[model samples]
Target chain A: AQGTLYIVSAPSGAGKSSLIQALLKTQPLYDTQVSVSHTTRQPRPGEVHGEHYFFVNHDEFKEMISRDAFLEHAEVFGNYYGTSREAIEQVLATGVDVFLDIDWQGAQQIRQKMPHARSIFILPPSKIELDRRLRGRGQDSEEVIAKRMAQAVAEMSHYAEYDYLIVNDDFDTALTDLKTIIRAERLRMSRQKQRHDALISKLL
Target chain B: AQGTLYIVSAPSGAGKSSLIQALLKTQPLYDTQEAIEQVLATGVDVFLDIDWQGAQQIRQKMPHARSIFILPPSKIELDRRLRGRGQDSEEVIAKRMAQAVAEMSHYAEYDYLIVNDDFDTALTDLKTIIRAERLRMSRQKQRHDALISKLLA
Candidate 1:
């Protein structure tokens, strides 16, 4: 019941997934897990139902909206994707932290739906490095590179809306910054009071 | 215009100073061989390991100063620490214990709190706070403005 909900957003080259993987590899890590999204898109090879994506029919997805179930939902390429408020709350109730890899729009909606979900933005160190990473140093055509960079910047425009920002300059250091923010948030007074109730009663 | 300011508070026997000293040993820390306020004003992160009263004063002076309070793992551990500070008579020990309790009552005012159960963990927590604060949006907007603007371009 004491877990923290963190919304982690970044442009494609910012290595958000890499950082999250490194964090999980570093330790047991708050027994944390990434929150999965429910989607109307058909599953690809080896994409498990409850693990990769919660596959749902379009009518079911719309019913979720009518039932006031989703924290945020979005449509892309005619597929509906949603984050279940109850799905994450179940994990949080068991004292496990969860991270949401959401876009800026979903992050905005989640803030109103679940005000306590801490939001973070990841950034690459510089424009040149971001271009290098996105272009894979010439694996893509000039036109593709320019198009991807514009999309990247559009995604990055919401960095200021987040509560925390981590520059992905050094892989290890950025991972530490990410983990430390989670640790510190757990120490917030209201959360700590609930977690350490017995100890506080005895000590104070 | 300056680096982040920090206020660290703890009750007696909570090992707050020891953690701060350990952090200093790692270098690029909060010691002010300079005029402390001058160093802070000149863009160096500074943390004052003061009591809650001083914590309150610094809050008014710099509202953004991140404050942390340290505490022991348990009440028994704290009592043992209080008694172990030898050369003190039983009466002195009693007085010190009361003072520690009084100091810790203000823990709610802090922005973060650390459990000094294990010295190593507490030291790491101290360093992490500084590391994490360094990345705050306000500070990095100043430090990384050119890079941020470049990305926007």
Candidate 2:
């Protein structure tokens, strides 16, 4: 059986990254791995080349774009970022579950190309709490924080488009919900048909 | 959140009844028609076990009821499980096997299917479906009305 592709999207400060990272740390049975996108943005102080991202220069990014190398690509604040088709295909072909940590735009594009990809949207507990978390970061200025909150609102508007929704009200509960979705989907009849092929033959 | 209705179905020797009994015994969730009505009045899910015939009748009335079909791991195991009961003649066992095959033929009619190879695993699978349904958007919207409003606010 081929591995399932999961698309996880959330507004900023919704604990999406934290949930995904914690899940990866658990190292699930199906060899879950996150896709490392190729980006033209300048790397920060300690970001590794291949681990954090596949950092490429503007010329290379353009060449890859022209060659249709990306499954989905977008420009954000003058930086070009995209998921590589070759990278995802290689892993999925080997029955390894792949998680794409992309926004709704990329999620839409991926669904169009690979209709079987399951998408999940995460919600922060409350707007006030979201604002507090945004400010708690101590990294962004007031203007940037305002901009991000507005962007988060826009993202949250499309929550209905997803196949599943996880309200990150409590970290542990949300984590359990996420794992349940993965486990339940794995046991679905479509997947189990192949998984139990030998057993089915012997039974019949 | 509104309680979900689940229909669990299996043939004679697939451990359907045993699994349902064990699940109810451990969970203490809901049992009997009166208990189901009482629990649903307070908003809790209910489980009902029936054959495909009964399942079809319920589906006709309540299209939303989720149906799960359970299957024994293999025919050999099915025969062994039936024989373990200790009273059926060879002819009776043969008849039941044929009935089971006919019953299993309609597996695709149900929403979910669980092979009752291991008792505990099958129980876990059933629990997952219940938990997942509880977290569904429509149900969660009703369950977390105030929380969702505050989140949006």
Candidate 3:
């Protein structure tokens, strides 16, 4: 079967990264990979060039943007960050599923470019729990926690735009739900046609 | 969450019954009633293992119902599987093989199709569909209504 593109978006403290990391950990096969974005920001210590980020220069980033090479690009803190269209295609051509961990804006852009990309939105269980989690981390004071809570609500308001919604209430259950989505989408008719071409011909 | 109705239809020897039986494990099967209102009211899913003809009738009344069709890998394998069931007479086996092909022809009408090339794989596929459907937005919304409101607030 050809590779599938998954765009996963979640507000901060929704346990998005934890769920994705656990999924990747359990599914160690070469068939699945998390997409690495190109960024003009300097790589942090121990960050690999291609594996962590493409680590492009500002001019090179602008050049690629002018060439329409990115599936979606945005400036955050005056640094360029975007998903490379060519890189996604190259990985997909190899039949490896790509996971794009982006916010709702990036998800919207990717959906326009690849309508087949399955997008999922992760939500925290409740306002009380979300606040608890934010405070539970211990670094944030009350004012900082309030600011983050507002930001979280703003991001979560766009949940309705996603194809699938996962409430990160229970980690294990949410992980199981994520795995089921991947497996069920694989069995979709269009992909099945490719995967079972010979068998389909023989049967029909 | 309200229960979902899953219509599992397959040609003979495609292992549809086995997959559903395995999925339910110990849960008893529910036959077709006048309507599934009571079943849905109970918030429990109902699985109907029927032929394509019955599937079509149910679909006419319940267009929202999800259906899955199972197909044997090939005609040769279908014949082999039918003959393996020693209880059937030769004439009956030939009749069944023909009927199987006729049933297989409508596989595309189903929302999902599972090729029963491997029993375990097919069972996993069926289970995955059930799990995914259970997590669908409408059902999940019903299940987590209070939580959703709390989060929104």
Candidate 4:
């Protein structure tokens, strides 16, 4: 039986990363094998090569592009990062659930490539809450925060673009909702019909 | 945030029961619950009643009618079977990840039900599977299955 793919998107500071981390920690059975994209950027402190990324030179990365190796990739912050179809297929074959934590642009692209993939857009309570969450991190300055908010709005504008919308109100509740949505989606008849195809075919 | 509620409906032998069990076990955080209802003409196997005027005439039981409680699928069956008995469906027979389930159609009653929650999308993949799985195990089998499948499809 093949596993279901979950596309979880949320603003950077809305706790998407933390939520996903918590989920992976608690739910070991569900694979959180998020694609570690190859990147041209240098690894930061505490970031390992395989764990954080597959550091590659621009030339090697470009060679991969020529081969149509990535599921979805993009050049961001002057560094390129993208998923590889070959790697994804390998992971998928192991019956592992994959989560693609990408922006709406890449998300749209992934959905286009794999129509069976499930996508969820995470929303914070409001821009005010979003700002607070970002500021609470104490990383970005006012200018950076404002710029991120603008991008967040742009990203969230694609909310209706997703099949599911999840508001990140309380982290626990939101995570529960996320888990439920995933669980329910996996049992979809069309997805499962292949199992009973022979029996159903006989009926026909 | 209160998660989106998916109302599921299907005919008997549609595989709704086994789907619910798998969903509950696999995704325990989902708080999967069901709805229970009153019994019909069939009398209970055991009697335990309160003292009241004409206790003999005071007969109460669960019905095949839709439930009034929103517990899990397993609970729904227990409550229903205590008032009676029945069988399960094949779609729910597969392994945890095995294919055979189908989405049900009581979703319209839900604020955000997924009838066509197809495998085309993960959101669709999960909802469609659970509802379809539920329908396969419905007791009303024939009538509910036809009606709901048409709605979901």
Candidate 5:
């Protein structure tokens, strides 16, 4: 069976990245790969060329855009970033679930191109929890909370478009939710039907 | 999170019995009529093992009820399990298979579907559906509304 595509979106401070990284360490059978997008920005120190992202220059990014190579692409802060449709398909075809950490706009585009992709929206339970997460330490600063919440609100507005939702308040339980959602989708009737055709034919 | 209603359906030897038995040991996660509502009121998953017709009825009454359909790995395995009961007849075998196919036809009506191909894996899948349902936006919002408010505030 081909691997399922998952579009995992979350507002900043939702613990989405942490939940996904933890899942990778805990489960081996799932064999998921966080999608590596191609970007036109310089990689920060310690960010690998391929692992962190497929680092490309502006010329290469424009070449890809003109060739219709991206499943979705957008400009953020003067830098171009995009998910390579061909790369994602290749990974999923190998039966490894691919998680796309994208904004709502990118998620929408991916869904249009790959209707089967399952989208999930993750959010924190409370503002306090998000503040704690965003601060990374005790801080009494209204500026940080106000500025960040504004951006977070914009992202959280599209939560309803997703097929699944995870509130990342309790780390362990939130991780469990992620795990369960993936497992259930994997066992969905549509995905399993073709793989078990032989068994189904005889049973019927 | 509030409890979820699950309708687990299958034919005679599809291992539905064994799967539910295993779930009860850990999860009691799932049954009744007015009786089922009592357990669910306690915020515990109540699984009702029933046929498609019963599942349809339950869905009508409880729109939030999540149904799961379980299928056997193959007809041969089902027949083997059927014969294991020491009853053997061509007519009986044919009758059972027909019933199974008939039941399976309604699988699409349910919320989730699985093949009881392997007991442990199927059990895991069952639990997965239960846990996932508990995280739905409606339920999660209800469960953590005040917190959500503070977050938004």
Candidate 6:
């Protein structure tokens, strides 16, 4: 049945995507799905309606944000990207939890909205490794790389703000740790009340 | 090599002893150990820390609420129980986060507890499970197990 939600966070180059992919392959997500965020930016090449993002015009996005229609939303690089409250509510209504790949600020917003959202912060294990990963890609100039690194440091400085800190030293190991944390949290009695109640009711 | 403090919690009848035993057997519990409570009941065997003539005499002697406390309990639990154990090392102190066989009412007293470090990471999606452990009823231990099992389930 449906239950609590979890917020998974990592810096831009923390290899969170790889870890998530490996996690899903190893075991069932147990009624989990990605939170489809609404974005004002135009879709990239070959992006689908629901897969890449929930593409929306500026007016629709603004309306949703004004009505508090999102669990968490943010503006970056002159574009607005946000999660719809209705979409997540629909997921929760069906007894499923949604995972959002958002910033720490977005994670806090989700917790504020749900008051039960669980957050985990992913780290690259070292600043040098993170810089190398960013620069080695060759997608940005030296200046851009330096700026991104600065942002990464600022982001990592808030590690204590997170409830959990995961070091992505090894790709597979990080995935394993993430999966372990999620599995452990889902078994809480308060969260398991619905299932326990149903099971006991059948016995009764 | 240091990680966050997590608790392992479960109901009294939930076979926690077996689970913890299994985990400890397979994996290094890191620095985890069970806190054996030094209970001084009237007819219980093994310990004779408390002396009592009768119910009336016992009540007269102690004149206090229940005092069955863990002998050198968890740094968190010990501090709460005695109220003056100073600070505990935050390094690898993974105290056994099991629920008491008795009912849980003092769940609010624990501080800096972690829960539900399951043996296997084979299960999918451990996020909710870990966070759930954070708010368990052990309030630390029970919460952790509950959270951990959520992912397992």
Q: What share of the true interface contacts does each candidate keep?
A: 0.68, 0.42, 0.57, 0.05, 0.65, 0.11
- Of the two candidates 5 and 6, the one with more favorable DockQ, higher being better, is 5
DockQ of each: 0.66, 0.47, 0.57, 0.06, 0.50, 0.08
Tens digits of per-residue lDDT for model 2 on B95-128? Answer: 8788888888777688877888888998888777
Stretches of candidate 4 exceeding 4 Å from the true structure: A29-32, A137-141, A190-204, B1-153
State which candidate has the highest DockQ.
1
Q: Give the TM-score of candidate 1.
A: 0.90
TM-score of chain A of 4: 0.85
lDDT score of residue B64 within candidate 2: 76
Candidate 2 accuracy as TM-score: 0.83
Badly placed stretches (over 4 Å) of model 2 are A28-31, A42-51, A137-145, B1-3, B25-46, B56-63, B85-88
Tens digits of per-residue lDDT for model 1, A13-82:
9999889877877556457888999999999999999988999899999999999999999889989999
Model 1: how far is A85 from its true place, Å? Answer: 2.2
Local distance difference test scores for all models: 0.84, 0.81, 0.82, 0.53, 0.81, 0.52
Name the lDDT of candidate 1. Answer: 0.84
lDDT of 5 at A145: 72
lDDT of 2 by residue, A1-204 (tens): 588899999998889999988889998646788889999998999999988899999999999999999999999999999999998888888888888999988989999998988888888887888898778757778898988888888888777778887888789999999888877776666767767787766655
Where does candidate 1 stray beyond 4 Å?
A26-30, B29-37, B85-87
TM-score of each: 0.90, 0.83, 0.88, 0.57, 0.79, 0.62
lDDT (C-alpha) at residue B27 in model 6 = 35
Model 6, residue B36: what's the lDDT? 19
Better of 1 and 6 by lDDT: 1
> Considering only chain A, what is the TM-score of each predicted structure?
0.91, 0.89, 0.93, 0.85, 0.88, 0.86
Better of 1 and 3 by TM-score: 1
The interface root-mean-square deviation of each model, in the order shown, is: 1.6, 2.1, 1.9, 16.4, 2.5, 15.2
